[PDB]
Design a protein around this ligand. Structure first.
Ligand SMILES: Nc1ncnc2c1ncn2[C@H]1C[C@H](O)[C@@H](COP(=O)(O)OP(=O)(O)OP(=O)(O)O)O1
Ligand SMILES: [Ca+2]
Ligand SMILES: [Ca+2]
Ligand SMILES: [Ca+2]
Length: 341
DNA sequence: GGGGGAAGGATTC
DNA sequence: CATGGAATCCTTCCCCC
């Protein structure tokens, strides 16, 4: 089995560059403005020019403007990036029937029944990067290995605008030297727990009694990591389907007032239903982000689909439940619909 | 004991 | 200071044969 992972370079920003080439060259910062104060919000992402000075996804626009006060700042245009993505995604389909679209800019392809070896996989890679570059003018990074996991790691090493292969020879070397924290699905919280257990490299998971690993990080993560170090990780490329659709917004100011919060919530439901586009959910959740950035949600499943009408009143109940049960203020409020018929 | 769904949350990207 | 959409997994209940 041969997997080929494709990850579009600094996507949102590069899309902005494509639409207005004049940007090419200057540091571009695509940010999500939260309507609170001036320039309140976080950075969705930035092109590498800006990344060099520490302006990256996650940080306050405010901190960004402080570092690069003269960089170009754009308001994230999701639908646009989304449509561009869908196109780039379609091209890959022309390279493999089996395609797993991981995110707005990631895809895995099972190029087993199309290639015989890694030399040919690499070629197919270059051929792909080139296609997308002509058709859309979008630079992407390619990763190629024996399984999805190492395929991604491959790309992680090669970006930006790179193409790398991780042959069975290197796969073994990495299992031995790759910092466990660079393994997908291993965030800070998990990586730190792994340190305390002494586990610092994929292999290290072998030097520990299973059960203790399962207790410290969970059975799922355990079996996953272990199957990686044992070189037996082999999950197939599966077409994934949307199981949930929601939307959350940020309020001008924190609140615990049902009448002041209702609007925001009702707005979230509006967009949510619009995105359902003929999809009917039997489950609704009200999600709330407390002033101290904590997250609490209250949901409910129904034996029948949900009308917007229903969703409206039901969501007010759950919000009331949140308020009655959580003394803190609410910073962000939203809804999430799932369990589509 | 144990299947199985629901709810609230944790963690990742 | 701190956006935001969505998947997967974990723990705890709960109904019940
Ligand atoms: N914190 C975030 N908030 C909103 N959108 C985000 C955030 N982080 C990432 N994204 C989105 C926009 C990114 O361009 C996109 C695709 O891949 P991702 O690796 O996350 O970013 P990227 O393309 O900018 O980085 P890279 O060029 O290093 O691969 O995901
Ligand atoms: Ca990317
Ligand atoms: Ca990505
Ligand atoms: Ca990591």
């Amino acid at each position: 089995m041969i997997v080929l992972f494709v990850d579009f370079d600094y996507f949102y920003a590069q899309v902005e560059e494509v639409l207005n080439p004049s940007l090419k060259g200057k540091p571009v910062v695509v940010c999500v403005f939260s309507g609170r104060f001036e320039d309140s919000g976080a950075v969705a992402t930035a092109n590498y020019e800006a990344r060099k000075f520490g302006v990256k996804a996650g940080i306050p626009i405010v901190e960004a403007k402080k570092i690069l006060p003269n960089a170009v700042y754009l308001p994230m245009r999701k639908e646009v990036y989304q449509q561009v993505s869908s196109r780039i995604m379609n091209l890959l389909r022309e390279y493999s029937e089996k395609i797993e679209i991981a995110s707005i800019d990631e895809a895995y392809l099972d190029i087993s029944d199309k290639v015989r070896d890694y030399r040919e996989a690499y070629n197919l890679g270059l051929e792909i990067k080139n296609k997308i570059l002509e058709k859309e003018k979008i630079t992407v990074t390619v990763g190629i290995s024996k399984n999805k996991v190492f395929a991604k790691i491959a790309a992680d090493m090669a970006k930006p605008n790179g193409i790398k292969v991780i042959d069975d020879e290197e796969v073994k070397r990495l299992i031995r030297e790759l910092d466990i924290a660079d393994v997908p699905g291993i965030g800070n919280i998990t990586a730190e727990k792994l340190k305390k257990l002494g586990i610092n490299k994929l292999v290290d998971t072998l030097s520990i009694e299973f059960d203790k690993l399962k207790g410290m990080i969970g059975e799922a993560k355990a079996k996953y990591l272990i199957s990686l170090a044992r070189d037996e990780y082999n999950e197939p490329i599966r077409t994934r389907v949307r199981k949930s659709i929601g939307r959350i917004v940020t309020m001008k100011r924190n609140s615990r007032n049902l009448e002041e919060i209702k609007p925001y919530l009702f707005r979230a439901i509006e967009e949510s239903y619009y995105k359902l586009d003929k999809r009917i959910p039997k489950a609704i959740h009200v999600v709330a982000v407390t002033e101290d950035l904590d997250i609490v949600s209250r949901g409910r499943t129904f034996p029948h689909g949900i009308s917007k009408e229903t969703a409206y009143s039901e969501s007010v109940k759950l919000l009331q439940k949140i308020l009655e049960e959580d003394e803190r203020k609410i910073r962000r409020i939203g809804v999430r619909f799932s369990k589509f018929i």
